[PDB]
Amino acid sequence: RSPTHNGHLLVGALKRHQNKPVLFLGDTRLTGGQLADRISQYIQAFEALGAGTGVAVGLLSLNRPEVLMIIGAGQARGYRRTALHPLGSLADHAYVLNDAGISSLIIDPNPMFVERALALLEQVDSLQQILTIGPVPDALKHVAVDLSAEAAKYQPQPLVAADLPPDQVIGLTYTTTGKPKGVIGTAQSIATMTSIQLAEWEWPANPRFLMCTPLSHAGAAFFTPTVIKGGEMIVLAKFDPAEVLRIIEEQRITATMLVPSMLYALLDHPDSHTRDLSSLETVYYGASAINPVRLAEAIRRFGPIFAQYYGQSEAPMVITYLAKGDHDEKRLTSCGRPTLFARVALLDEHGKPVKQGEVGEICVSGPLLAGGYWNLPDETSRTFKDGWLHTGDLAREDSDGFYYIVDRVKD
Amino acid sequence: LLRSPTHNGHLLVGALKRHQNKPVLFLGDTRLTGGQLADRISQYIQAFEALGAGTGVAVGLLSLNRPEVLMIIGAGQARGYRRTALHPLGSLADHAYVLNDAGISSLIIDPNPMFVERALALLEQVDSLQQILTIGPVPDALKHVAVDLSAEAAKYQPQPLVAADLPPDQVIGLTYGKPKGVIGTAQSIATMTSIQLAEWEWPANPRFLMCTPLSHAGAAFFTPTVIKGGEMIVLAKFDPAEVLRIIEEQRITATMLVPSMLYALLDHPDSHTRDLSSLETVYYGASAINPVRLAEAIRRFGPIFAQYYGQSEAPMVITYLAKGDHDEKRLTSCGRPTLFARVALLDEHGKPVKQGEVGEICVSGPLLAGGYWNLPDETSRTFKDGWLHTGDLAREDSDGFYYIVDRV
């Protein structure tokens, strides 16, 4: 009766598609087996470097082929990972690392992150070693070790996924004008999110996914589902509207995830009128972000291929979902319809369900919920309370069931 | 209830609410929408509890294919009524044993002469059987013991449909040497549904055709169909000509066809006459398959077929053959094991066998059922090995395909 975690699903999918290319990264095509072998080698390196099981490891990297190998290692064996934001502040990075007790920092060896690593070594006392994915820079010569080279020294072994408890903390998302709170990512929570993605989101058969967004933060969230459904993922390291539209035309991209900025840029590009983007079946996009009028323009120009998802860090990505066919003029301001795999309700100040039409607070209940806040019991008890996670988002509901996010409780 | 899982009824109620105005059920003249179905389901719930056939009461189901069967099923799905479906053409001995073991107090029957004679005979055998529940006007020979469940439900007013929050391991069903009743738990069934929606190749808005009994397997296809935004055209009986007609007329995109039914469709003059292009995903795999006829079906209609495999102990999602994975060598395969559950071919000691070695299909995960009704020895033997001994022996292919060779 023991639940399977994300690692089980990922390892198995890579084995299922051992000869099928699952990753494309500029000049790096990896098949399922190729990726699995590299992930196994990375695991070996991690454990030998003292950045494996039982160790909190950080990640400050841009889109690289190795990022997904690191992610896969942490998925399989349940390494507690904390992703640092590329454009985050030193103070915030320090807080995050110190709070999570991060001992090793995997960085992309570019000048900016090299400087950050050095500075963090001073502030973060738990930070001992730096792992560089790529030849160690001379500024970090005495404090860093090429993790990629260590992995290459190791031998590809059969990839296995550690059987972890459902409540095993496998991640800490911090993400304000205040101290970042570490949302406890449990094995169960992530597995639930993935299951709902595959069960409710309109995933194209064999999704040809275009990842134009940070892998450090949303890689596993799309890669795992893509390859479970037998798909390929072309990851862009940079966003150039022309290039993106060209890739869709050439590689016949069926699925992608865009942010407001990306959508607007594509819309405004002259090549969007020229390139054939008929292959695009499902474009995922986030909640409370894309201007309704620009979204309408997009629907009129490229078809209703757009699908909105809404989630928090306490309830990752699948609270609500707006379908492509449900993208009507009225629902351009809607975040979507509540999931069935989790109990979602609009409650008032007293915690009683509001009437349909009234503005209430989105509240979620189910195993999608995260474990709480890292070493913050009071905040956990004030957010996850009375059998409900209190999102802090205010919303109303129409006669059909669509939630319309008005504001925040804070507001 | 912070992190408590949801059950199949939560999904069912929610889907009927999402599609409150979208036609969802189609049996002959009865074209009920999601909201209409929900209303009837509520009325049925009210009647069930009043007649003493609701919560805490073991109920039985001996019916054919009526639109009311789905309302009865929906009631038990939402509130967790332990239902035990009796096989239409089952023997008296089987039926009696099933009812006696389960403790069936009320028997919902389709009021056709055969089932009313069976009802009377079962009343005499099973003494726990107190009352009968006729779906429709009570026959005179049953008038002394049966109630028109349909009329009872009609008295009640449609109430908002709610799904009773049930514990993960709540016995919500009992599926039956001597027939052993598998303990269907809320969790097990919910897991099955989730895997169906995720791994199975459901077409966009499945226009499902149900030429199979709504009892036993109806919910397992209806719920996913309506979650995917589709509707179910259910045939009262399997008649090849009719099936072919519906595929053409009502643009059927999905159909569960057991081996026998598929063979009959193949050998029909109307298979050449009617259009079958609308058909996208044919689910099959109830009871094995003949690779020869599989080949001929793929030759005629394309690779639009999909094989599922699963025992009573692990619903219907152990392995799954994909439409495109149906190769000439893979006509004998049962499919590749699911990623969402730990399926491994084990040895005598329980050691994972080699690729090319014959082992026992063993399933670990929330999918596996509770055990066996009042059969502790069998719970410890079939289940409780840390896995689930299905009793099937299979062989792994290079790609991972399981090839059922033999059975213990």
Side-chain angles (χ1 to χ4, degrees):
Chain A
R1 236 64 121 267
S2 162
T4 59
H5 70 120
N6 249 223
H8 281 139
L9 323 168
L10 169 103
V11 168
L14 294 184
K15 173 239 125 9
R16 263 205 171 179
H17 311 109
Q18 44 217 342
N19 325 296
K20 188 193 89 41
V22 295
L23 199 49
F24 294 89
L25 231 325
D27 289 320
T28 340
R29 181 236 236 211
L30 279 334
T31 67
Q34 278 187 279
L35 201 53
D37 287 340
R38 226 92 92 91
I39 285 167
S40 131
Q41 282 168 282
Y42 263 77
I43 286 154
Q44 288 164 82
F46 279 122
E47 313 266 8
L49 286 175
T53 316
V55 191
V57 209
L59 183 65
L60 186 46
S61 183
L62 305 164
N63 289 10
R64 266 184 88 127
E66 309 116 82
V67 181
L68 266 171
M69 304 160 188
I70 291 152
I71 285 169
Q75 245 181 286
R77 326 285 313 170
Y79 299 153
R80 180 158 54 98
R81 305 256 216 238
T82 300
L84 281 186
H85 189 250
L87 326 152
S89 104
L90 162 66
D92 255 17
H93 279 194
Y95 188 83
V96 165
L97 289 210
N98 275 300
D99 206 273
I102 301 275
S103 346
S104 350
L105 190 60
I106 314 156
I107 57 131
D108 203 321
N110 51 79
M112 187 193 182
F113 294 166
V114 163
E115 151 256 310
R116 192 48 63 87
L118 283 155
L120 282 180
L121 279 153
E122 316 144 3
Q123 327 222 322
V124 192
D125 338 274
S126 64
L127 209 55
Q128 303 299 114
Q129 46 157 12
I130 301 289
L131 306 181
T132 39
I133 14 156
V136 197
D138 270 6
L140 279 165
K141 218 232 110 267
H142 323 285
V143 251
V145 32
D146 197 351
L147 155 77
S148 88
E150 295 302 320
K153 287 162 208 138
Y154 277 112
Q155 349 99 68
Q157 252 121 82
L159 197 54
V160 260
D163 289 345
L164 311 158
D167 37 270
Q168 173 70 241
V169 194
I170 55 155
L172 265 186
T173 29
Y174 275 75
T175 319
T176 136
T177 66
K179 287 156 155 5
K181 332 223 128 318
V183 208
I184 299 165
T186 94
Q188 202 188 46
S189 163
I190 309 293
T192 316
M193 176 207 67
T194 318
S195 299
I196 309 170
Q197 284 171 312
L198 306 152
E200 262 188 13
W201 291 13
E202 287 149 316
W203 278 98
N206 312 302
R208 190 111 173 133
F209 207 86
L210 192 58
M211 193 57 167
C212 351
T213 19
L215 286 174
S216 45
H217 293 91
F222 288 108
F223 187 68
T224 320
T226 295
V227 305
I228 277 167
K229 298 232 350 182
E232 303 86 33
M233 203 202 225
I234 296 98
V235 185
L236 309 173
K238 32 143 293 247
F239 190 88
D240 167 50
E243 153 231 47
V244 179
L245 307 151
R246 189 183 355 241
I247 291 299
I248 298 159
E249 210 195 47
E250 288 162 331
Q251 319 288 306
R252 290 288 138 216
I253 293 283
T254 74
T256 185
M257 202 270 288
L258 299 176
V259 310
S261 140
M262 292 174 181
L263 197 114
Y264 309 154
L266 288 195
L267 264 52
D268 294 329
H269 211 262
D271 281 2
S272 62
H273 309 79
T274 81
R275 302 275 179 190
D276 182 53
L277 324 161
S278 70
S279 44
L280 268 181
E281 292 175 54
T282 322
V283 178
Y284 293 115
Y285 71 96
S288 321
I290 310 224
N291 171 248
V293 206
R294 298 299 302 271
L295 176 68
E297 173 199 342
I299 293 160
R300 290 180 292 239
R301 292 203 39 216
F302 314 116
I305 52 189
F306 306 96
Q308 188 168 170
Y309 59 88
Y310 156 70
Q312 291 223 309
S313 233
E314 291 86 18
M317 305 161 86
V318 283
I319 307 177
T320 72
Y321 181 69
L322 197 47
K324 304 179 297 214
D326 287 345
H327 264 47
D328 323 304
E329 188 77 42
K330 198 193 157 183
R331 278 95 224 210
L332 298 183
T333 37
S334 163
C335 65
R337 260 208 275 240
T339 179
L340 317 173
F341 300 94
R343 292 163 307 251
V344 190
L346 289 172
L347 313 180
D348 45 51
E349 2 143 358
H350 297 165
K352 324 172 309 214
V354 306
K355 314 173 1 230
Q356 184 251 287
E358 302 190 326
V359 168
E361 182 191 15
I362 321 205
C363 277
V364 216
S365 189
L368 164 66
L369 270 45
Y373 298 119
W374 197 246
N375 314 334
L376 295 169
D378 286 337
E379 286 104 309
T380 304
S381 78
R382 251 71 111 198
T383 312
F384 293 86
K385 36 150 33 226
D386 325 304
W388 290 102
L389 150 72
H390 289 247
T391 66
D393 294 286
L394 288 180
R396 65 182 181 88
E397 194 204 300
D398 62 6
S399 62
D400 317 76
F402 298 98
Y403 274 9
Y404 288 81
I405 301 212
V406 203
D407 246 350
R408 300 255 328 162
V409 174
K410 176 228 142 301
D411 304 339
Chain B
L1 270 153
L2 202 53
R3 269 147 223 139
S4 134
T6 54
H7 61 78
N8 216 6
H10 274 113
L11 331 170
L12 166 105
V13 171
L16 293 184
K17 185 232 117 257
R18 283 172 157 183
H19 317 300
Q20 45 213 320
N21 316 305
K22 199 210 68 215
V24 111
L25 150 81
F26 300 94
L27 200 138
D29 70 296
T30 340
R31 308 196 224 173
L32 282 212
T33 72
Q36 289 188 286
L37 209 34
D39 292 339
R40 302 277 253 273
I41 284 166
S42 144
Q43 288 166 259
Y44 267 79
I45 285 154
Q46 293 169 85
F48 277 131
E49 310 265 15
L51 296 171
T55 39
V57 199
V59 221
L61 183 65
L62 193 38
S63 191
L64 300 168
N65 274 9
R66 301 181 64 127
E68 298 117 298
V69 187
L70 263 181
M71 318 169 183
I72 280 147
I73 286 165
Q77 215 174 314
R79 327 282 315 159
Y81 303 154
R82 172 161 49 104
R83 295 251 131 102
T84 307
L86 284 184
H87 258 300
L89 323 142
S91 99
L92 231 149
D94 297 325
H95 283 189
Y97 192 72
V98 167
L99 298 205
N100 273 300
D101 192 30
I104 303 295
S105 349
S106 320
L107 195 62
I108 320 156
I109 63 133
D110 201 324
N112 49 81
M114 200 223 125
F115 290 167
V116 323
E117 138 252 300
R118 194 46 72 88
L120 284 157
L122 285 177
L123 271 152
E124 266 86 89
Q125 235 118 327
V126 196
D127 294 327
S128 89
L129 242 205
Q130 302 299 115
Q131 51 130 344
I132 308 285
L133 276 182
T134 47
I135 325 167
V138 207
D140 235 275
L142 264 197
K143 253 170 194 102
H144 54 92
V145 80
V147 221
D148 191 343
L149 172 68
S150 309
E152 250 265 334
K155 300 162 357 155
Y156 300 109
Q157 208 257 305
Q159 289 314 295
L161 206 51
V162 262
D165 258 292
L166 302 152
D169 289 331
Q170 163 74 52
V171 201
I172 54 151
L174 226 53
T175 337
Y176 285 71
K178 254 139 9 119
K180 21 197 201 154
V182 98
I183 300 180
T185 81
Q187 187 73 256
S188 153
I189 308 295
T191 315
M192 172 207 69
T193 325
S194 85
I195 303 177
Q196 281 168 325
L197 295 159
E199 238 176 72
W200 291 17
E201 288 151 300
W202 289 95
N205 317 114
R207 292 220 71 169
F208 214 85
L209 184 59
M210 203 53 176
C211 16
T212 355
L214 277 178
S215 36
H216 318 273
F221 286 106
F222 185 66
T223 324
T225 293
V226 310
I227 285 164
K228 291 297 209 224
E231 8 101 347
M232 187 186 252
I233 315 241
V234 35
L235 263 147
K237 87 263 117 252
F238 170 67
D239 170 58
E242 250 309 293
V243 182
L244 268 356
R245 189 236 93 203
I246 307 224
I247 300 169
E248 186 188 58
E249 273 206 17
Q250 309 304 118
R251 302 125 278 149
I252 289 306
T253 69
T255 304
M256 197 266 276
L257 230 36
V258 319
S260 359
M261 307 204 284
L262 161 81
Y263 308 157
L265 280 210
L266 271 153
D267 319 319
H268 210 256
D270 284 325
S271 71
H272 322 93
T273 320
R274 272 98 187 228
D275 173 71
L276 270 91
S277 76
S278 59
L279 215 33
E280 293 172 47
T281 318
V282 183
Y283 289 121
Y284 76 93
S287 260
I289 197 63
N290 197 26
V292 200
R293 326 244 5 191
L294 241 178
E296 95 195 45
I298 289 156
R299 156 206 66 147
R300 283 202 56 202
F301 314 113
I304 49 157
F305 306 98
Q307 183 165 353
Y308 61 89
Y309 156 72
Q311 324 229 147
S312 86
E313 345 126 331
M316 268 147 53
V317 280
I318 304 185
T319 75
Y320 183 70
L321 234 166
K323 303 196 269 184
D325 267 346
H326 275 102
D327 286 20
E328 208 243 70
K329 15 135 180 0
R330 272 108 68 153
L331 288 175
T332 131
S333 182
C334 65
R336 292 220 278 225
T338 180
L339 267 8
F340 310 108
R342 280 172 221 96
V343 190
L345 298 170
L346 296 192
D347 250 326
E348 162 251 296
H349 6 83
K351 170 206 129 301
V353 309
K354 266 84 51 231
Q355 195 151 262
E357 220 245 88
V358 178
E360 191 165 29
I361 321 203
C362 285
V363 203
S364 167
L367 182 61
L368 78 108
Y372 279 128
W373 201 243
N374 311 136
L375 248 346
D377 13 73
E378 263 65 75
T379 79
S380 322
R381 211 242 325 123
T382 314
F383 310 76
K384 274 113 243 146
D385 358 70
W387 294 78
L388 165 60
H389 286 0
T390 59
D392 281 36
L393 311 152
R395 198 226 67 244
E396 206 169 50
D397 207 51
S398 45
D399 336 299
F401 285 88
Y402 275 5
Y403 275 73
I404 307 193
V405 57
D406 196 74
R407 271 175 44 212
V408 307

